[PDB]
Nucleic acid binder design. Sequence first.
DNA 1: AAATTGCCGAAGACG
DNA 2: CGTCTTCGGCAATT
DNA 3: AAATTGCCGAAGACGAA
DNA 4: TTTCGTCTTCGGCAATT
Lengths: 358, 361
Amino acid sequence: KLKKVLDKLRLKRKDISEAAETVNKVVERLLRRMQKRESEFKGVEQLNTGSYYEHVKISAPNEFDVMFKLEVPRIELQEYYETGAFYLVKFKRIPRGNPLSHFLEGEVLSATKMLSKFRKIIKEEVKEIKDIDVSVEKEKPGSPAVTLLIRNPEEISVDIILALESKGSWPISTKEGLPIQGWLGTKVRTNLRREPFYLVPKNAKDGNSFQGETWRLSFSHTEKYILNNHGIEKTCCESSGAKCCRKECLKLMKYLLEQLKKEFQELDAFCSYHVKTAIFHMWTQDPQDSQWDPRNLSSCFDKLLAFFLECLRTEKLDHYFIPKFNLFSQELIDRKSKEFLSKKIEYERNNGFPIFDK
Amino acid sequence: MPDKLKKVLDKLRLKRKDISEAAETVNKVVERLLRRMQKRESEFKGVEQLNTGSYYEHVKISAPNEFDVMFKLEVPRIELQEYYETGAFYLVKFKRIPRGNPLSHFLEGEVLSATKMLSKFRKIIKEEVKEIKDIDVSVEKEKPGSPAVTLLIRNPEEISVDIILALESKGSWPISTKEGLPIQGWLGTKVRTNLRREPFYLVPKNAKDGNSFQGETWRLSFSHTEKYILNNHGIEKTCCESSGAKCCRKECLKLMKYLLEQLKKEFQELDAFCSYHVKTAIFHMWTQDPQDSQWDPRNLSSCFDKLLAFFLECLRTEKLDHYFIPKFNLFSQELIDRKSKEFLSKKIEYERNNGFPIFDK
DNA sequence: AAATTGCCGAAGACG
DNA sequence: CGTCTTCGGCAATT
DNA sequence: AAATTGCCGAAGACGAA
DNA sequence: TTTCGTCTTCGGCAATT
Ligand SMILES: [Zn+2]
Ligand SMILES: [Zn+2]
C-alpha cells in the first residue's frame, strides 16, 4: 500500500540525468562567472543542499537548491532580540579594509544591498545563456534566493542561495540544539559543530524594523550530513548493512503535506521544513535502527503522524538546532490553521489516505 | 576466572598521577625535538607530529612508560616499487624536476636510502638531546629492525620514547592493501573509504641481516589508521560514549597483551612474538564479531576466551594475515619458526586450561 | 606562517 | 552508577 | 591556480531464481 | 510474490597538475 506510493514517488534515472545535466551546466557557468568577475563575491564557493541532494526529493527532479557561500572573517553577531534564529551582522575592528564596506548600512551588514548586487550579477550572466531556456524569477518576499526557472522543456526551479560562512563556534542559541547524543553520538555532534555555520538573508517584506539587515541561521549543510549518516549503526543503509525506512517515512510525510497544500489554501503557512523538523525529533526519540525497519513502515509512518499531530495540538515544534525557536508559535502560524491541518491529517489517517491516489 | 580478570585489569589500569608526570616530561622533550627539527636548516624542516601506539590508543598497560611518536615528512611525487611481492615492503623513487628537492643526498641511485635519511635524522636528534639539561635523557643505541630513534628518559622512572621517521604520501594506498581493512560489515563503507583517503606512511624496515637493498627498503605503517579504529571501534556510533554503552574490546586487548608479555618474560623461545601479533588477531576478531553486544563487559571472560581460541587457531594453521595487507602472513615459516608457534600454543593452552596462573604475578 | 586558543571526548578519581 | 578532572587532538585565529 | 582526476557510496534499472 | 546480485550514473571530496 505505502510501498506503491513510494514507488510512485521514486525518481526515474532518465529524468534525473536530463535535469542534472542542464542544472549543472547553468550553475557552473553562474558560479564561475561570479568567481571571476571583479566584485565582492569573487570568493563564493558552492554547496548543494535540500531535498534532491539529500535523496528525499519526490515525484520529479524539478527543484534544486544551491548555496553560494561567502566566508566572512571577523564578524560579530547581534541576536535579533528574542529570536535565537535571527541576527544582525556587525564587524570586529578591521585591520586594513572590509571589502563588504559598500554593503554596510550603519555598522550593520545590509542583506538587502548584498542580495541586490548578487542578484544583479546572476541576472546579467543569465541574459547571456543562449543554449538553455532560463530566466530569473522576480524577487519573492521572505526568500534568501535568486530563483532560476528552466524549461528543459520541463519546468525546473533552481534556488541560488546567498550565504555568509563563519568558521567560529556556533551562536549560543544553538548550544542545546542538535540533540543527537544518544543517536549519532557525541563525537559526531562535536565534529558537526566544528563545521562552519551559515547566515542567509531573512529578506522579509513586512516593513518591520531592520528588515533589510536581518539574517537567519541555516543548517542545511548539517541536515544534509545527517540524512546521509542517519543510523545509530555505521552500516545503516550501506552495502554491507541493513536498509532502514527513515528516509521513506520522510518522503511519505512530505507527500501528504504537499497533496494537502495543493488543494487547501488554508495551509499556506505550512512547509516541508516543518515535516523535516518533526522527523529529526522522531529520529532522536527513536534512535535504534531497528525502530525503523522496512517491515514496520506502516507503524513507523503512523508514529511520525501521531507526533506531528501532537506538535500541532500543543502549538509547539522546536527548531532542531535552535531549541527556543518555536516553528509553531502563534506569531508564525495562527491557531486556526493548525487545527485545520490536524483535522485534515486525522481524516486521511482514519480513511486509508485517499489523497495518496491523487 | 571473572574475578581474576577483573583484578588483573585493576592492576593494569594506569594511574592519573603517573600519567601526568610522564606526559609532562615526554611532551617537553618531544616538543623541543620537533621544533629543533623544524626551525633548523635541514632536510627535515617540514616534519609534522602524530602520536601513535598503545598509550595514545588508551591500551598501554601497567605504567605510562612507553610513548610512540611519528615525525612524518611529506614526500610529493614519489613512485613506489614493491620489493619481492611482499606487499609490505617497498623501494621509493622520485618522479621529476625541480631536482632541487631535499633528500637528493639521500639517494643511493634513483632510490631513496632509508639508512642515509635515518642517520641524519638520528644525528639531528642526538645533537639536540645533548643540549637538554633539565631532564635526564639519552638516545638509545640503534636496534635492528627499528624505524625509530629511541630516547631513554629517567623521570626518575624509566620511560622510552620512540621517535619514528615516516614518509607521508597523500595518494591512493598501494594495491597490496586493496582487499585489506575488512571493516565493511563492522565500521562500514563510508568509514573504510574515508580511512583510505587519509595518507599512507612508509618507515624504514632497517633490517640488518645483509639482504639486498637493506638500506633502501621501506615498509608500510598503518599506525594512524589503527589509532582511529581503536578510538572509533563500535558498530554503534555511541559505543563507549557518555550517552552510549561501554564495551570490553579494549579490555580484551589489554588482557591478551599482558598474557603475551608475561609469557615472553619467562620464555625466551617466544622472542619472535610481539604485541602487534595480538593487535592484528583482535582486529580480525572485531571483524568476525562486529556487534557491540558481542563485547558486553558482563561477558569479559567469554570474550577473552574467544580471542584466545582464535589466536590458537592462527598458530595451529600458521597463518595470521596482516589486517591491512591480506597476502602478508605474520605467522609464516620465514618470519617465525614452526617450533616457536607450537611452543606458544602449548603455553597459551596451559594458561587457558588452568585459569591463568601466570596472572597470579 | 608559528604557535596560542577553545572545545570537549576518554577514561581515571571520587562521592 | 554519576559527576568531576586532566590529557590529548584538532583547527580557527592572531 | 582553477579545475581535471579518481574513487566509491547511494540508489535507480532490471533479470533471476 | 519480494529481493538478492549486478550493473549503472550522479555527486562529494580533495589530491593533483
Ligand atoms: Zn538507514
Ligand atoms: Zn566500545
